[PDB]
Amino acid sequence: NAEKFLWGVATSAYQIEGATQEDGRGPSIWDAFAQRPGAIRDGSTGEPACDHYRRYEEDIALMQSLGVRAYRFSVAWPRILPEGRGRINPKGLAFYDRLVDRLLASGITPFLTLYHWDLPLALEERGGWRSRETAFAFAEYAEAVARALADRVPFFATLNEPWCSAFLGHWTGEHAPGLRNLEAALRAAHHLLLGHGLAVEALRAAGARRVGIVLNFAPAYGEDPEAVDVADRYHNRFFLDPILGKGYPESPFRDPPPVPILSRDLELVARPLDFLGVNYYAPVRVAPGTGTLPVRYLPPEGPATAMGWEVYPEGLYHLLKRLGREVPWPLYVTENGAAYPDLWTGEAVVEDPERVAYLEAHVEAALRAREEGVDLRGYFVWSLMDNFEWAFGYTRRFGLYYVDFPSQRRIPKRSALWYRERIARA
C-alpha cells in the first residue's frame, strides 16, 4: 500500500436523512421505537433529522471546504427494500447512486456502511435479528447495494457496531427494537455475525473491492483481573474473536441461554476481510458484580463528556496497539468524537474548546500508534454535523458543524476549523 492517510467524517442514514416517509422509504425499527413514550429523551424522532436527503450537496460542499477526503455514511436498508426483502425502491437506490457520483466529483472517497441499525420493521415483525432468515435477507440486501454502487464505492462495511444492535437493542432495551432478554440478544449477536459472513461473499461476488466490518470497543480497566477480563470478553472480544476465526470468547455470562450456532456458521463469520473499522469513545472501569454479567461499572476517573463518558485519549493508543498485534488487516478509526453542550445564539463560529481538545488528543494518540507500526489508514470524526443521537434525540451534539434544527442552518464550530487545520498540518 502507498495510499495517503484518509481524513474523514462519519454519519448514518437514520441520524441525518429525514425523508422518513418520502420517495418510497419503508419504516425501520427506529421509526417504531421512537413512537414509544420514554424511548427518546426529548420525545423526538428522525424526522426530519438534518434534512440530508434534500441537503446532501450542501453537506458535501462543507466536507470539501474542510479538506475531508473520505465520507463514511450508511445506506438505509428500508429505503432500498422497504419490506426488507422482495420489492425494490428505485428512488432510494437513485439517491445513493447520485450521492456517490457527487462525492467522487468532489474528490471524496465513499466509505459505505450497509447496516447502521435501521432494520426494516417488516423483518422485525418476523423476529428481526433473532430469526436466522434475517441474516440471509441482509446478505441479499448487501448484494443489491454492491451491484448498484461497487463500481464507484471502494469500501463496504457490513455492520456498524453489532454489540450495540445486539445488547443495547435486545438486552438493555435502550436501542431499537427495545427488547430486554439475554437469549434474544445472543440470538441477535449470532445472526448479525452470520449476516456479516454471508454478506462478505455476496459483496465480493458483486464487485466490492474492500470489504470490512465496524466494531466498537470499550477497553476495560479495574483492580480485579477477573472482572476486567469478563468486561473485555463482553465489550471487545465478543464480535472480534469470531471474525478472526477464534470462535466466541469464553462466555462472560453466568449460566447463559442457548445460542443458535449451526454447523459451519463460524467459518462463514470468519471469512477474510480487507479492513477493520474501529469505533472508540471511552473505556469502561469495572469491579466484580453478582449479576448475569458479573461486573459493576464504576464512574469515570476524572473528566468526562456530556454523555458522562470518560475522556481517555491514551486508551485509543493502547487499543490500536493491541489491535495491530491481533488483527491481520488494516485499521480505520471509523468513529471518534465527543458531545459537549453547544447552544448557538447567532455567532459565526460556535466555540467548542472542549470538543477541540478531545479531538486533538485522540488524533495524537492514534497517529502515535500508527507511527510505531499500527497499520492505521484513516480517521473519521463522528460526526460531520449534529444529528439524531439515538435514545438522546437532539439533546446531545457530536458535530463539527452545529445544526440549528428548526432552520437546518449549519454553522461551523471551532472544531470544524480545527479539523481543517489538522488535516493539512505538517
PDB file of all heavy atoms in Angstrom, residues 144-171:
ATOM      1  N   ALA A 144     -27.467  -6.409  -3.409  1.00  0.00           N
ATOM      2  CA  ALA A 144     -28.154  -5.421  -4.235  1.00  0.00           C
ATOM      3  C   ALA A 144     -27.423  -4.093  -4.216  1.00  0.00           C
ATOM      4  O   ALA A 144     -27.250  -3.448  -5.258  1.00  0.00           O
ATOM      5  CB  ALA A 144     -29.570  -5.243  -3.766  1.00  0.00           C
ATOM      6  N   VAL A 145     -26.992  -3.656  -3.038  1.00  0.00           N
ATOM      7  CA  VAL A 145     -26.312  -2.374  -2.946  1.00  0.00           C
ATOM      8  C   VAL A 145     -24.983  -2.415  -3.695  1.00  0.00           C
ATOM      9  O   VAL A 145     -24.639  -1.479  -4.412  1.00  0.00           O
ATOM     10  CB  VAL A 145     -26.121  -1.943  -1.483  1.00  0.00           C
ATOM     11  CG1 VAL A 145     -25.351  -0.648  -1.403  1.00  0.00           C
ATOM     12  CG2 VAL A 145     -27.467  -1.784  -0.782  1.00  0.00           C
ATOM     13  N   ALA A 146     -24.212  -3.493  -3.540  1.00  0.00           N
ATOM     14  CA  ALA A 146     -22.952  -3.605  -4.280  1.00  0.00           C
ATOM     15  C   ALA A 146     -23.196  -3.656  -5.785  1.00  0.00           C
ATOM     16  O   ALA A 146     -22.452  -3.051  -6.564  1.00  0.00           O
ATOM     17  CB  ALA A 146     -22.157  -4.806  -3.812  1.00  0.00           C
ATOM     18  N   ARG A 147     -24.208  -4.400  -6.223  1.00  0.00           N
ATOM     19  CA  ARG A 147     -24.493  -4.443  -7.655  1.00  0.00           C
ATOM     20  C   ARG A 147     -24.750  -3.041  -8.208  1.00  0.00           C
ATOM     21  O   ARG A 147     -24.431  -2.780  -9.373  1.00  0.00           O
ATOM     22  CB  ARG A 147     -25.660  -5.377  -7.952  1.00  0.00           C
ATOM     23  CG  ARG A 147     -25.294  -6.827  -7.773  1.00  0.00           C
ATOM     24  CD  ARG A 147     -26.475  -7.738  -7.910  1.00  0.00           C
ATOM     25  NE  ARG A 147     -26.952  -7.787  -9.269  1.00  0.00           N
ATOM     26  CZ  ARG A 147     -28.002  -8.500  -9.667  1.00  0.00           C
ATOM     27  NH1 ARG A 147     -28.699  -9.207  -8.792  1.00  0.00           N
ATOM     28  NH2 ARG A 147     -28.379  -8.536 -10.939  1.00  0.00           N
ATOM     29  N   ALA A 148     -25.324  -2.154  -7.412  1.00  0.00           N
ATOM     30  CA  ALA A 148     -25.613  -0.781  -7.843  1.00  0.00           C
ATOM     31  C   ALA A 148     -24.402   0.159  -7.702  1.00  0.00           C
ATOM     32  O   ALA A 148     -24.229   1.108  -8.456  1.00  0.00           O
ATOM     33  CB  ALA A 148     -26.780  -0.256  -7.005  1.00  0.00           C
ATOM     34  N   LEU A 149     -23.574  -0.020  -6.666  1.00  0.00           N
ATOM     35  CA  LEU A 149     -22.630   1.017  -6.251  1.00  0.00           C
ATOM     36  C   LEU A 149     -21.170   0.589  -6.229  1.00  0.00           C
ATOM     37  O   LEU A 149     -20.300   1.467  -6.103  1.00  0.00           O
ATOM     38  CB  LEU A 149     -22.980   1.567  -4.849  1.00  0.00           C
ATOM     39  CG  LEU A 149     -24.398   2.096  -4.662  1.00  0.00           C
ATOM     40  CD1 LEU A 149     -24.554   2.614  -3.240  1.00  0.00           C
ATOM     41  CD2 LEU A 149     -24.739   3.183  -5.675  1.00  0.00           C
ATOM     42  N   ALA A 150     -20.861  -0.696  -6.290  1.00  0.00           N
ATOM     43  CA  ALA A 150     -19.479  -1.155  -6.120  1.00  0.00           C
ATOM     44  C   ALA A 150     -18.560  -0.742  -7.253  1.00  0.00           C
ATOM     45  O   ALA A 150     -17.333  -0.801  -7.087  1.00  0.00           O
ATOM     46  CB  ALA A 150     -19.413  -2.652  -5.921  1.00  0.00           C
ATOM     47  N   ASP A 151     -19.096  -0.302  -8.389  1.00  0.00           N
ATOM     48  CA  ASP A 151     -18.245   0.231  -9.446  1.00  0.00           C
ATOM     49  C   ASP A 151     -17.523   1.508  -9.022  1.00  0.00           C
ATOM     50  O   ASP A 151     -16.514   1.849  -9.603  1.00  0.00           O
ATOM     51  CB  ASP A 151     -19.022   0.448 -10.748  1.00  0.00           C
ATOM     52  CG  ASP A 151     -20.107   1.483 -10.664  1.00  0.00           C
ATOM     53  OD1 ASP A 151     -20.648   1.773  -9.619  1.00  0.00           O
ATOM     54  OD2 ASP A 151     -20.426   2.060 -11.722  1.00  0.00           O
ATOM     55  N   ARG A 152     -18.071   2.221  -8.041  1.00  0.00           N
ATOM     56  CA  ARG A 152     -17.544   3.509  -7.601  1.00  0.00           C
ATOM     57  C   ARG A 152     -17.198   3.585  -6.120  1.00  0.00           C
ATOM     58  O   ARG A 152     -16.397   4.437  -5.740  1.00  0.00           O
ATOM     59  CB  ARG A 152     -18.548   4.615  -7.915  1.00  0.00           C
ATOM     60  CG  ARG A 152     -18.628   4.964  -9.390  1.00  0.00           C
ATOM     61  CD  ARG A 152     -19.923   5.625  -9.767  1.00  0.00           C
ATOM     62  NE  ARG A 152     -20.997   4.652  -9.594  1.00  0.00           N
ATOM     63  CZ  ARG A 152     -22.186   4.866  -9.061  1.00  0.00           C
ATOM     64  NH1 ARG A 152     -22.575   6.078  -8.721  1.00  0.00           N
ATOM     65  NH2 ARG A 152     -22.966   3.816  -8.818  1.00  0.00           N
ATOM     66  N   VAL A 153     -17.808   2.775  -5.273  1.00  0.00           N
ATOM     67  CA  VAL A 153     -17.568   2.808  -3.833  1.00  0.00           C
ATOM     68  C   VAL A 153     -16.479   1.790  -3.507  1.00  0.00           C
ATOM     69  O   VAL A 153     -16.712   0.598  -3.675  1.00  0.00           O
ATOM     70  CB  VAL A 153     -18.853   2.442  -3.067  1.00  0.00           C
ATOM     71  CG1 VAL A 153     -18.553   2.271  -1.582  1.00  0.00           C
ATOM     72  CG2 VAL A 153     -19.923   3.488  -3.295  1.00  0.00           C
ATOM     73  N   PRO A 154     -15.303   2.210  -3.037  1.00  0.00           N
ATOM     74  CA  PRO A 154     -14.248   1.211  -2.792  1.00  0.00           C
ATOM     75  C   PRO A 154     -14.468   0.390  -1.538  1.00  0.00           C
ATOM     76  O   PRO A 154     -14.074  -0.781  -1.513  1.00  0.00           O
ATOM     77  CB  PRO A 154     -12.966   2.036  -2.708  1.00  0.00           C
ATOM     78  CG  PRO A 154     -13.288   3.347  -3.370  1.00  0.00           C
ATOM     79  CD  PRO A 154     -14.761   3.587  -3.012  1.00  0.00           C
ATOM     80  N   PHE A 155     -15.054   0.987  -0.506  1.00  0.00           N
ATOM     81  CA  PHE A 155     -15.116   0.402   0.826  1.00  0.00           C
ATOM     82  C   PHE A 155     -16.550   0.110   1.229  1.00  0.00           C
ATOM     83  O   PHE A 155     -17.378   1.025   1.269  1.00  0.00           O
ATOM     84  CB  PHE A 155     -14.527   1.347   1.878  1.00  0.00           C
ATOM     85  CG  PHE A 155     -13.063   1.631   1.721  1.00  0.00           C
ATOM     86  CD1 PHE A 155     -12.611   2.732   1.015  1.00  0.00           C
ATOM     87  CD2 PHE A 155     -12.121   0.794   2.295  1.00  0.00           C
ATOM     88  CE1 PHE A 155     -11.245   2.969   0.875  1.00  0.00           C
ATOM     89  CE2 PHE A 155     -10.777   1.047   2.181  1.00  0.00           C
ATOM     90  CZ  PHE A 155     -10.333   2.110   1.456  1.00  0.00           C
ATOM     91  N   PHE A 156     -16.817  -1.149   1.565  1.00  0.00           N
ATOM     92  CA  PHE A 156     -18.092  -1.598   2.112  1.00  0.00           C
ATOM     93  C   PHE A 156     -17.865  -2.221   3.469  1.00  0.00           C
ATOM     94  O   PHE A 156     -17.130  -3.195   3.588  1.00  0.00           O
ATOM     95  CB  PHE A 156     -18.743  -2.663   1.222  1.00  0.00           C
ATOM     96  CG  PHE A 156     -19.296  -2.144  -0.075  1.00  0.00           C
ATOM     97  CD1 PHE A 156     -18.478  -1.819  -1.145  1.00  0.00           C
ATOM     98  CD2 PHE A 156     -20.653  -1.974  -0.226  1.00  0.00           C
ATOM     99  CE1 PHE A 156     -19.004  -1.334  -2.327  1.00  0.00           C
ATOM    100  CE2 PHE A 156     -21.185  -1.479  -1.428  1.00  0.00           C
ATOM    101  CZ  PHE A 156     -20.354  -1.172  -2.464  1.00  0.00           C
ATOM    102  N   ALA A 157     -18.511  -1.674   4.487  1.00  0.00           N
ATOM    103  CA  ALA A 157     -18.585  -2.297   5.798  1.00  0.00           C
ATOM    104  C   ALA A 157     -19.965  -2.920   5.932  1.00  0.00           C
ATOM    105  O   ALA A 157     -20.975  -2.265   5.646  1.00  0.00           O
ATOM    106  CB  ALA A 157     -18.352  -1.305   6.917  1.00  0.00           C
ATOM    107  N   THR A 158     -20.025  -4.161   6.369  1.00  0.00           N
ATOM    108  CA  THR A 158     -21.296  -4.850   6.522  1.00  0.00           C
ATOM    109  C   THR A 158     -22.133  -4.184   7.624  1.00  0.00           C
ATOM    110  O   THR A 158     -23.229  -3.666   7.371  1.00  0.00           O
ATOM    111  CB  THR A 158     -21.039  -6.318   6.818  1.00  0.00           C
ATOM    112  OG1 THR A 158     -20.153  -6.385   7.925  1.00  0.00           O
ATOM    113  CG2 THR A 158     -20.454  -7.046   5.606  1.00  0.00           C
ATOM    114  N   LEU A 159     -21.620  -4.249   8.849  1.00  0.00           N
ATOM    115  CA  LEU A 159     -22.284  -3.868  10.076  1.00  0.00           C
ATOM    116  C   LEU A 159     -21.571  -2.684  10.707  1.00  0.00           C
ATOM    117  O   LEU A 159     -20.351  -2.620  10.764  1.00  0.00           O
ATOM    118  CB  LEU A 159     -22.254  -5.065  11.026  1.00  0.00           C
ATOM    119  CG  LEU A 159     -22.921  -6.305  10.426  1.00  0.00           C
ATOM    120  CD1 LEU A 159     -23.052  -7.445  11.438  1.00  0.00           C
ATOM    121  CD2 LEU A 159     -24.333  -6.026   9.909  1.00  0.00           C
ATOM    122  N   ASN A 160     -22.354  -1.800  11.332  1.00  0.00           N
ATOM    123  CA  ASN A 160     -21.868  -0.853  12.312  1.00  0.00           C
ATOM    124  C   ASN A 160     -22.198  -1.345  13.709  1.00  0.00           C
ATOM    125  O   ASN A 160     -23.353  -1.457  14.100  1.00  0.00           O
ATOM    126  CB  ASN A 160     -22.552   0.491  12.057  1.00  0.00           C
ATOM    127  CG  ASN A 160     -22.079   1.495  13.077  1.00  0.00           C
ATOM    128  OD1 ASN A 160     -20.990   2.054  12.982  1.00  0.00           O
ATOM    129  ND2 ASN A 160     -22.937   1.725  14.085  1.00  0.00           N
ATOM    130  N   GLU A 161     -21.162  -1.630  14.504  1.00  0.00           N
ATOM    131  CA  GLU A 161     -21.325  -1.840  15.935  1.00  0.00           C
ATOM    132  C   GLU A 161     -22.397  -2.861  16.299  1.00  0.00           C
ATOM    133  O   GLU A 161     -23.369  -2.549  16.995  1.00  0.00           O
ATOM    134  CB  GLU A 161     -21.553  -0.519  16.660  1.00  0.00           C
ATOM    135  CG  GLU A 161     -20.453   0.483  16.396  1.00  0.00           C
ATOM    136  CD  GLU A 161     -20.591   1.738  17.219  1.00  0.00           C
ATOM    137  OE1 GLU A 161     -21.471   1.785  18.103  1.00  0.00           O
ATOM    138  OE2 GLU A 161     -19.755   2.645  17.085  1.00  0.00           O
ATOM    139  N   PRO A 162     -22.200  -4.120  15.899  1.00  0.00           N
ATOM    140  CA  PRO A 162     -23.168  -5.154  16.257  1.00  0.00           C
ATOM    141  C   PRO A 162     -23.330  -5.332  17.763  1.00  0.00           C
ATOM    142  O   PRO A 162     -24.392  -5.778  18.194  1.00  0.00           O
ATOM    143  CB  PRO A 162     -22.623  -6.420  15.567  1.00  0.00           C
ATOM    144  CG  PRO A 162     -21.142  -6.122  15.395  1.00  0.00           C
ATOM    145  CD  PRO A 162     -21.096  -4.661  15.087  1.00  0.00           C
ATOM    146  N   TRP A 163     -22.333  -4.992  18.583  1.00  0.00           N
ATOM    147  CA  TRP A 163     -22.526  -5.067  20.031  1.00  0.00           C
ATOM    148  C   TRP A 163     -23.699  -4.198  20.447  1.00  0.00           C
ATOM    149  O   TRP A 163     -24.502  -4.589  21.301  1.00  0.00           O
ATOM    150  CB  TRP A 163     -21.237  -4.673  20.756  1.00  0.00           C
ATOM    151  CG  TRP A 163     -21.335  -4.776  22.248  1.00  0.00           C
ATOM    152  CD1 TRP A 163     -20.909  -5.811  23.038  1.00  0.00           C
ATOM    153  CD2 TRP A 163     -21.869  -3.802  23.134  1.00  0.00           C
ATOM    154  NE1 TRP A 163     -21.175  -5.547  24.355  1.00  0.00           N
ATOM    155  CE2 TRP A 163     -21.754  -4.313  24.444  1.00  0.00           C
ATOM    156  CE3 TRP A 163     -22.393  -2.529  22.960  1.00  0.00           C
ATOM    157  CZ2 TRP A 163     -22.184  -3.599  25.561  1.00  0.00           C
ATOM    158  CZ3 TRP A 163     -22.822  -1.814  24.069  1.00  0.00           C
ATOM    159  CH2 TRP A 163     -22.726  -2.363  25.361  1.00  0.00           C
ATOM    160  N   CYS A 164     -23.802  -2.988  19.888  1.00  0.00           N
ATOM    161  CA  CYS A 164     -24.929  -2.123  20.211  1.00  0.00           C
ATOM    162  C   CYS A 164     -26.244  -2.744  19.735  1.00  0.00           C
ATOM    163  O   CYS A 164     -27.205  -2.863  20.506  1.00  0.00           O
ATOM    164  CB  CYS A 164     -24.760  -0.739  19.618  1.00  0.00           C
ATOM    165  SG  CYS A 164     -23.415   0.193  20.378  1.00  0.00           S
ATOM    166  N   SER A 165     -26.293  -3.153  18.482  1.00  0.00           N
ATOM    167  CA  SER A 165     -27.520  -3.724  17.949  1.00  0.00           C
ATOM    168  C   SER A 165     -27.976  -4.925  18.787  1.00  0.00           C
ATOM    169  O   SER A 165     -29.184  -5.081  19.041  1.00  0.00           O
ATOM    170  CB  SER A 165     -27.336  -4.191  16.507  1.00  0.00           C
ATOM    171  OG  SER A 165     -27.076  -3.100  15.644  1.00  0.00           O
ATOM    172  N   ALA A 166     -27.047  -5.782  19.179  1.00  0.00           N
ATOM    173  CA  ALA A 166     -27.413  -6.952  19.959  1.00  0.00           C
ATOM    174  C   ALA A 166     -27.788  -6.561  21.386  1.00  0.00           C
ATOM    175  O   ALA A 166     -28.901  -6.781  21.845  1.00  0.00           O
ATOM    176  CB  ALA A 166     -26.218  -7.906  19.977  1.00  0.00           C
ATOM    177  N   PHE A 167     -26.864  -5.982  22.144  1.00  0.00           N
ATOM    178  CA  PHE A 167     -27.054  -5.837  23.585  1.00  0.00           C
ATOM    179  C   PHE A 167     -27.852  -4.601  23.971  1.00  0.00           C
ATOM    180  O   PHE A 167     -28.677  -4.688  24.876  1.00  0.00           O
ATOM    181  CB  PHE A 167     -25.716  -5.932  24.309  1.00  0.00           C
ATOM    182  CG  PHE A 167     -25.089  -7.295  24.146  1.00  0.00           C
ATOM    183  CD1 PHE A 167     -23.970  -7.478  23.358  1.00  0.00           C
ATOM    184  CD2 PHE A 167     -25.662  -8.400  24.755  1.00  0.00           C
ATOM    185  CE1 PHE A 167     -23.428  -8.743  23.199  1.00  0.00           C
ATOM    186  CE2 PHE A 167     -25.131  -9.655  24.596  1.00  0.00           C
ATOM    187  CZ  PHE A 167     -24.005  -9.832  23.802  1.00  0.00           C
ATOM    188  N   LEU A 168     -27.620  -3.463  23.333  1.00  0.00           N
ATOM    189  CA  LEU A 168     -28.462  -2.301  23.612  1.00  0.00           C
ATOM    190  C   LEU A 168     -29.847  -2.468  22.995  1.00  0.00           C
ATOM    191  O   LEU A 168     -30.846  -2.010  23.546  1.00  0.00           O
ATOM    192  CB  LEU A 168     -27.806  -0.999  23.173  1.00  0.00           C
ATOM    193  CG  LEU A 168     -26.418  -0.755  23.765  1.00  0.00           C
ATOM    194  CD1 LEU A 168     -25.909   0.608  23.295  1.00  0.00           C
ATOM    195  CD2 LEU A 168     -26.416  -0.838  25.268  1.00  0.00           C
ATOM    196  N   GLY A 169     -29.930  -3.099  21.823  1.00  0.00           N
ATOM    197  CA  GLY A 169     -31.209  -3.285  21.180  1.00  0.00           C
ATOM    198  C   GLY A 169     -32.066  -4.374  21.774  1.00  0.00           C
ATOM    199  O   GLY A 169     -33.287  -4.327  21.624  1.00  0.00           O
ATOM    200  N   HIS A 170     -31.449  -5.373  22.414  1.00  0.00           N
ATOM    201  CA  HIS A 170     -32.172  -6.541  22.845  1.00  0.00           C
ATOM    202  C   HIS A 170     -31.978  -6.981  24.282  1.00  0.00           C
ATOM    203  O   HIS A 170     -32.716  -7.858  24.710  1.00  0.00           O
ATOM    204  CB  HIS A 170     -31.902  -7.768  21.943  1.00  0.00           C
ATOM    205  CG  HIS A 170     -32.168  -7.542  20.497  1.00  0.00           C
ATOM    206  ND1 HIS A 170     -31.261  -6.982  19.647  1.00  0.00           N
ATOM    207  CD2 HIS A 170     -33.251  -7.818  19.724  1.00  0.00           C
ATOM    208  CE1 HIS A 170     -31.778  -6.958  18.411  1.00  0.00           C
ATOM    209  NE2 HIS A 170     -32.996  -7.453  18.419  1.00  0.00           N
ATOM    210  N   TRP A 171     -31.001  -6.412  25.013  1.00  0.00           N
ATOM    211  CA  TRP A 171     -30.789  -6.766  26.413  1.00  0.00           C
ATOM    212  C   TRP A 171     -31.124  -5.595  27.335  1.00  0.00           C
ATOM    213  O   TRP A 171     -31.943  -5.760  28.251  1.00  0.00           O
ATOM    214  CB  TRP A 171     -29.398  -7.314  26.689  1.00  0.00           C
ATOM    215  CG  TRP A 171     -29.322  -8.039  28.007  1.00  0.00           C
ATOM    216  CD1 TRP A 171     -30.331  -8.619  28.712  1.00  0.00           C
ATOM    217  CD2 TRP A 171     -28.138  -8.276  28.751  1.00  0.00           C
ATOM    218  NE1 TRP A 171     -29.850  -9.207  29.850  1.00  0.00           N
ATOM    219  CE2 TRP A 171     -28.497  -9.022  29.885  1.00  0.00           C
ATOM    220  CE3 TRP A 171     -26.794  -7.977  28.553  1.00  0.00           C
ATOM    221  CZ2 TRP A 171     -27.570  -9.432  30.841  1.00  0.00           C
ATOM    222  CZ3 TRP A 171     -25.874  -8.409  29.510  1.00  0.00           C
ATOM    223  CH2 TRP A 171     -26.265  -9.124  30.629  1.00  0.00           C
TER     224      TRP A 171
END
